[PDB]
């Protein structure tokens, strides 16, 4: 397999439609040994991850909790065994309060809400790298999930701003990770119909926002020279595994686009 | 003059080396009528602005203070006279706690500090546009100050991340400003020897950081096809005035580089 | 006026809908003294330019003709008077054979045709700078016309490739121009309904291509936060004059977008 | 292996230091069955390729020769067997006459020389895709070699312009390739000490140019968070194989940077 013998931490599983569930599944099909991290609903996450090809230890991780971050490396070492280190880390964590996305005017998002969204979606990429680089092997790889924020778009609003901050954070994380012989990169995915995105398209954050995201999804598939299937996270999961492998060894502080090539076409 | 008859708000003056002092001076030499905003040290700011070519009303504005923002439009209207609106707005506000810049490791900046820096340096660009767009004329212009964060660099650290967030915020502010017939853009300046930057180069944030910024300044002038004079904010001030004028009427959500062309050259 | 006392060469006038006709008109309204260059149909160009606010000498210039380029500086000096130099140069020249644009498959453009298009549209920006920099004043400005080629698009095909080459050429021209104290930049315009573009939208290069360009024009205005009027070259002409002025003195090897801000928005 | 069962065409081998020699070696170590194409010195290329892990048929291909291109698909089919198609294509072809690189002034490169360089280095990426897409399998991959031309640099001169044209061509090739279920991408490599580059650094194109390229190589390794070894093409070859594999299935019209992450850092 592509990831034979590799020990990889995967964060971000919440439902069977989480991009991280598909990253974890593909990594296990490719021979990786996983450690999973989950936020808040651990009973649910364990029941979800019981469907993965192989059993994997699940550790609690709230990226806003300094105690969870400070104990993380020790908890991972206990799970993978003393003397063993991680070869890979997957950050698949994103959050923005409802005031920062959808029909709520861009100017009406309170800073406490924007700040919480940037903490979870951008700053935590650095918090995770800080916690785990001391237990990572040379040749290792840290991968985060991105949504191309180079241009503004309707409805995504402050989540796009958080992704711009994440892209910048990734370039700095690469400088630090390089000292350990570790790569840091993001995968910029096309839109995926997770449970939350299906709810948003269905109008959970207002009708106009849902209508705008549905048009954006259609336009994405139209622009993509190879098409874009929003119901299929497998091409995104494969791309993350490519970055976790030894096959992109000179790429760091960078962004790989798993978007059907849509960002390279105007119409 | 380039800005004859225009009513322009200019924030960010703290010393006679502030980029905003030079923006204000050039705008007044070009016939603009100014309203100034100042943070915390109003007695100092008034004494500084007494050196400007023309007298201008000074209003207090702490961008973290919601009361200051909510009363801002009314305070500006009182200063410029009922029935008059602003033609231009200059955001020349930037801050990052010492833990987020210099020799302090990138991973050691606490989130409360990063969050305060992003609030002042990025979110406030939207807070200012929210407060002032209701009192801006069609054909108007909002300009913010940027430092090219497309690539990571030593010492600037979390200030670079805040600039990446600002660039993203500017693209969204342009969408909102467009409804008022108003443009929103940033000027990405080359490094300027303000009092704070001179202190930083002098080692105020650690020796290695000072050494790295001095090398970055030298490299900037070397790469710039027309050179770069860090002791001269006038070319930056002129660029801001170009954006405040009627001469870039189809440019919005964008970035104009006043950096001697250094970002267009590798060596 | 914005360009009072400036001596500016303007190439590219062919009809009253040429972007260069509007650049020339605005520059003259702003006090510039012009020298015009025209290709092949000089009687037509003289009759067109008789409509400009002021009379201006017209010189023949085929950018593929080495003799025209070698004699150009001497012919301009004769027109503006010995001892006088140019302050500005406008390159508003673009060409691509019909095999390289429209419904003709991208793979069916013969290299002789692509090469002629790149010679006229990209290489000539350097040929013009070579010919005219020896007769340009310090503080001078060279401006070329661009159409954002960062992403592929239907119908524009090899003209987009020629614009990518032009953007690269502009960065090198800036290095050379800098030695003379001269700036080099491009204005990336939104789509303009010139006589040729109206014919193309009308199906002159095939129906599907015309349909695609009409959809691209509509999408441009929709994405533009301040809108985009394809029938109005005046905002583009104003932007060129901004770059020819003393108000963007630290910008070189760069691209200014006069496109209503459309390139900064995805939808 | 990563490329087990895949039939891949590899162009561009001239010496044992050619990036394509290392692409071919890695692809064979990874189970690919190769067809090689060589220009002009076929006896030399055969002797070089005798050192590859496995024997591979060698076909003549001058990309400026229309007869070679028109017969290419038939010659490849004859080599791989009737009923078999290619899964991958590697374009590792680049050329620029000496007048277009080095100390020769940028303005002194005759257009016939620039045109030949753009034909071989950029247009041929489309010529190759045209010839080979009719004999490529769905899920297939076309990869070309790039050198980041986003910013101008000393000495590389018109070769950089040819790479800007190549990047644009790649975006259009992706549109065409997509109709066949085929991806098109470029690998932007850091500087590699091929025989020609060693000669150039040694002063073959002038002393100043050699000095500038040596400084650029040093700066590249300094900026790279994981370092950059110019004497090692293996990380570049691995990246090309990653794109030829099934592990980046949603990436097209794009650029993957195998440069040690140097393009993501300013200093
Ligand atoms: N769905 C899309 O269209 C799309 C597109 C591009 C990128 N992404 C990104 O992919 C990543 C994964 O999101 P997803 O779409 O699979 O959605 P998801 O809801 O399945 O996953 C997001 C995860 O973030 C976790 N999380 C939230 N707050 C946390 C905290 N305080 N500590 C730790 N974990 C926390 C959640 O528990 C959840 O597991 C995110 O970064 C998202 O922005 C999504
Ligand atoms: N100096 C450089 O090299 C450089 C380069 C590019 C961009 N910039 C940007 O230019 C802008 C102006 O900075 P400068 O370099 O002139 O420095 P400065 O210290 O003179 O100005 C920064 C201003 O921010 C103000 N400020 C801080 N916190 C505030 C708050 N809570 N509310 C309101 N105002 C607040 C300060 O009072 C000060 O007037 C900033 O955005 C900065 O990031 C500076
Ligand atoms: N029209 C648009 O939508 C649009 C958008 C962006 C940029 N542009 C660019 O603006 C510039 C001006 O074009 P336009 O749209 O006004 O069209 P146009 O037809 O009015 O002007 C193009 C000019 O190129 C000249 N030209 C062609 N071959 C020449 C040669 N061998 N030597 C000298 N001059 C030669 C023509 O004589 C003509 O004056 C071009 O670079 C074009 O690509 C156009
Ligand atoms: N060496 C570097 O530093 C570097 C960096 C980035 C990208 N590249 C690119 O990598 C690719 C391979 O070049 P390289 O550095 O290995 O050098 P190289 O000299 O080993 O290979 C270039 C190849 O181009 C071939 N070629 C030239 N004219 C041709 C024609 N008319 N028809 C067919 N083939 C022709 C040559 O025969 C040779 O095999 C080129 O695209 C080059 O620009 C090189
Ligand atoms: O908390 C709100 C929220 C989180 C994540 C997503 C997924 N996503 C889409 C684009 C970027 N991320 C969507 C909403
Ligand atoms: O609060 C710390 C601080 C604020 C502003 C500056 C100026 N600057 C340089 C680059 C970007 N901004 C520098 C330090
Ligand atoms: O010779 C064919 C031709 C020349 C110029 C144009 C204008 N243009 C549109 C986009 C870029 N340039 C269009 C066709
Ligand atoms: O024909 C001259 C020539 C060809 C290829 C190279 C390799 N290269 C370096 C950067 C881009 N390509 C260098 C010179």
Author numbering:
A (entry chain A), B (entry chain A), C (entry chain A), D (entry chain A): 3 to 269
What does the article say, verbatim?
Isoniazid (INH), a successful frontline TB drug for more than 50 years, targets the NADH‐dependent 2‐trans enoyl–acyl carrier protein (ACP) reductase InhA. This is a key enzyme in the Mtb cell wall synthesis pathway and does not have a human orthologue. InhA inhibitors are known to modulate the tertiary structure of the InhA protein binding pocket, in particular the substrate binding loop (SBL). Herein we describe the screening of such a library, in comparison with other fragment sets, against the highly validated Mycobacterium tuberculosis (Mtb) target InhA.
Crystals suitable for structure determination were obtained for fragments 4, 9, 12, 22, 24 and 34 bound to InhA. However, the pyrazole rings occupy the same sub‐pocket, stack against the nicotinamide ring of NADH, and the 2‐N‐pyrazole provides an H‐bond interaction with the 20‐OH group of NADH. In contrast, pyrazole 4 (pIC50<3) has a slightly altered binding mode, where the hydroxy group has an additional interaction with Met98 backbone NH.
